From a paper:
One class of assembly cofactors are the ribosome-associated GTPases (RA-GTPases), a subset of P-loop GTPases within the TRAnslation FACtor associated (TRAFAC) family, of which the proteins [name], RbgA, Era, and HflX are members. [name] is a nonessential, highly conserved late-stage 30S assembly cofactor that has been implicated in the docking of helix 44 (h44) of the 16S rRNA into the correct conformation and therefore correct maturation of the decoding center prior to subunit joining. The overall structure of [name] consists of three domains: the N-terminal OB-fold, the central [name] domain, and a C-terminal ZNF. Both the OB-fold and the ZNF domains are involved in nucleotide recognition and target [name] to the 30S ribosomal subunit, where they contact major helices of the 16S rRNA.
To look more at the mechanism of (p)ppGpp-mediated inhibition of RA-GTPases associating with ribosomal subunits, we solved the structures of [name] in both the apo- and ppGpp-bound states by X-ray crystallography in order to compare to already-available GMPPNP- and GDP-bound structures. The 1.94-Å structure of [name] complexed with ppGpp reveals the presence of the nucleotide unambiguously represented in the electron density map, whereas the apo structure at 2.01 Å lacks any electron density in the nucleotide binding pocket. The ppGpp ligand is bound in an elongated conformation, where the 3′- and 5′-phosphate moieties face away from each other. The guanosine-5′-diphosphate backbone interacts with the G-domain in an identical manner to the more well-characterized GMPPNP, with the P-loop/G1 motif stabilizing the α,β-diphosphate and the G4 motif specifically recognizing the guanine nucleotide base. The 3′-diphosphate extends away from the core of the protein, toward the solvent and appears to be stabilized only by a long-range 5.5-Å electrostatic interaction between the lone electron pair on the ε-phosphate of ppGpp and the basic lysine residue K116. In our structures there is no electron density corresponding to the Mg2+ and the switch I/G2 loop is unresolved, likely due to innate flexibility when not contacting a γ-phosphate. In addition, the switch II/G3 loop does not appear to form hydrogen-bonds or electrostatic interactions with the ligand. In contrast to this, the GMPPNP-bound structure features a fully docked switch I/G2 loop, positioned adjacent to the bound ligand and the binding site of the Mg2+ ion, although the Mg2+ ion itself is not resolved. Crucially, in this conformation, the docked switch I/G2 loop occupies the same space that the 3′-diphosphate moiety of ppGpp would. Compared to our apo - and ppGpp -bound structures, the switch II/G3 region appears highly similar to that of the GDP-bound structure, leading us to conclude that the OFF conformation is maintained whether in the apo state or when bound to either GDP or ppGpp and that the switch I/G2 loop would remain disordered in the absence of GTP.
Numbering used by the authors: 1 to 180, 201 to 288
The structure:
């Protein structure tokens, strides 16, 4: 009996990594049904057969998961944004953060293409990134003069998934891990996923009421709003509006919250 992570799902066979060693397995029990089907990222217990094969007996309860692509137990969602081509957008970033937190994921922020960003713009982006650091995120701003493999290995242990639009620079990182459905590649201290989590933006699962939970500073300062479910829009005695007023929440963050709050409700 062995325990490990699914790094590949190929026509119903599940490659499980156990500290480097690969085993090709098939589900048994409940796990043969679509409704309980294993997914890449799952931690499983399997019985070994035929030296490098096995039967999955148990799939451990998922800590989190994405549906498209289907991938589970992500330890850090790295949101990849370009500084230029296309221009850095707090509007897009904030949205990608809302999605990440709606899936219960640890997020961090990676801005790319520093080498081709005008230096005055670099300075403006660094200030913006400091706001995100204030909220609690780790941020990096990198370009072609940086060692992308040192960057990745210094990230937290476990499963990293990159998320961002085509063109931001994800493959440039991933090509460092390629043996050369989502597939996970090995890194020292974990894995990194071959597909992004959410190149695009899907809010369908999100209720207007949850949006404040996913703006972390609003959630935190919302603690001392008079109303326990204050949405920080028209309510009296609102600590988010107070903190906004005395400069402890950025106006753009509040503006984006409002926009999303109003947008989210609407019909598609
Ligand atoms: N200057 C600079 N460019 C970056 C950086 N990161 C990524 N790029 C470039 O941006 C483009 C998209 O990168 P990918 O790595 O393919 O992005 P993706 O997977 O998110 O879609 C590529 O350029 P391309 O269209 O292939 O043209 P070229 O730049 O290869 O000449 C890539 O080389 C960076 O940090 N600095
Ligand atoms: Zn409030």
């Amino acid at each position: 009996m062995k325990t490990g992570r699914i790094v590949k799902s190929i026509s119903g066979v599940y490659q499980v990594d156990v500290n480097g060693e690969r085993f090709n397995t098939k589900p048994r029990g409940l796990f043969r049904k679509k409704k309980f089907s294993p997914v890449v990222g799952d931690i499983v217990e399997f019985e070994v057969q035929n030296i490098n094969e096995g039967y999955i007996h148990q799939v451990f309860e998922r800590e989190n998961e994405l549906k498209r692509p289907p991938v589970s137990n992500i330890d850090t969602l790295v949101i990849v944004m370009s500084a230029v081509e296309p221009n850095f957008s707090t509007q897009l970033l904030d949205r990608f953060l809302v999605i990440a937190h709606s899936y219960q994921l640890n997020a961090r922020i990676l801005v790319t293409k520093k080498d081709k960003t005008p230096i005055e713009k670099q300075f403006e982006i660094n200030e913006l990134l400091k706001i995100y650091e204030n909220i609690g995120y780790e941020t990096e701003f990198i370009g072609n003069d940086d060692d992308r493999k040192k960057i990745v290995e210094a990230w937290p242990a476990g499963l990293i998934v990159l998320s961002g639009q085509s063109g931001v620079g994800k493959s440039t990182f991933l090509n460092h891990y390629r043996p050369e459905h989502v597939e996970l590649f090995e890194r020292q201290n974990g894995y990194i996923a071959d597909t992004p989590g959410f190149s695009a933006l899907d809010f369908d699962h999100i209720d207007k009421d949850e949006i404040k939970d996913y703006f972390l500073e609003l959630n935190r300062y919302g603690e001392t709003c008079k109303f326990r479910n204050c949405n920080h829009i028209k309510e009296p005695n609102c600590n988010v509006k107070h903190q906004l007023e005395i400069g402890n929440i950025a106006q753009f963050r509040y503006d984006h919250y409002l926009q999303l709050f109003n947008e989210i409700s609407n019909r598609k």
